[PDB]
Design a protein around this ligand. Structure first.
Ligand SMILES: Cc1cc2nc3c(=O)[nH]c(=O)nc-3n(C[C@H](O)[C@H](O)[C@H](O)COP(=O)(O)O)c2cc1C
Length: 147
């Protein structure tokens, strides 16, 4: 299968997460395209992908704010070709915040609204993602099993 991974990461945690996931899928034989949301154009971005994994860190305090680089893609998510697309979301956050990984929640709801096929529940990482490598690898393993 061909998987596209697009991540928004301010301090590199969601980015580490996306590389962990990319490696897990590549090891299994998938063709993987892992791109920073900052370098992507939304227009037909998901076309030709069997699977699309969207990663985004959560910002804000009393409001969910999406990682800055992910914002333009989320704002134009309806142009990506998500309808019928197998997708899944992951992201880094902090459980002490009101909306822990609320960015995963917002993106998943938009994907749902665009007719995307959410193959697995979102991966929500609390704190340093390197300390949750087992969960990341496990979630990537489950997503492959799920498509
Ligand atoms: C000012 C500020 C606001 C934050 N807001 C949230 C939040 O609302 N929910 C959450 O789960 N984490 C929140 N975080 C935690 C970050 O999402 C977390 O540090 C994450 O690991 C950063 O991932 P990144 O390096 O891929 O951008 C916040 C962090 C800061 C510093």
């Amino acid at each position: 299968p061909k998987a596209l991974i697009v991540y928004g990461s301010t301090t590199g945690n969601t980015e580490y997460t996306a590389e962990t996931i990319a490696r897990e899928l590549a090891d299994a034989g998938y063709e993987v395209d892992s791109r920073d949301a900052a370098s992507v154009e939304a227009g037909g971005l998901f076309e030709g992908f069997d699977l699309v994994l969207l990663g985004c860190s959560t910002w804000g305090d009393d409001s969910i704010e999406l990682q800055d680089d992910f914002i333009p893609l989320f704002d134009s998510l309806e142009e990506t070709g998500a309808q019928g697309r197998k997708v899944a979301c992951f992201g880094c956050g902090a459980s002490s915040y009101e909306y822990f990984c609320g960015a995963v929640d917002a993106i998943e709801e938009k994907l749902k609204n665009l007719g995307a096929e959410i193959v697995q529940d979102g991966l929500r990482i609390d704190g340093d993602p390197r300390a949750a490598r087992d969960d990341i690898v496990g979630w990537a393993h489950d997503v492959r099993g799920a498509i």
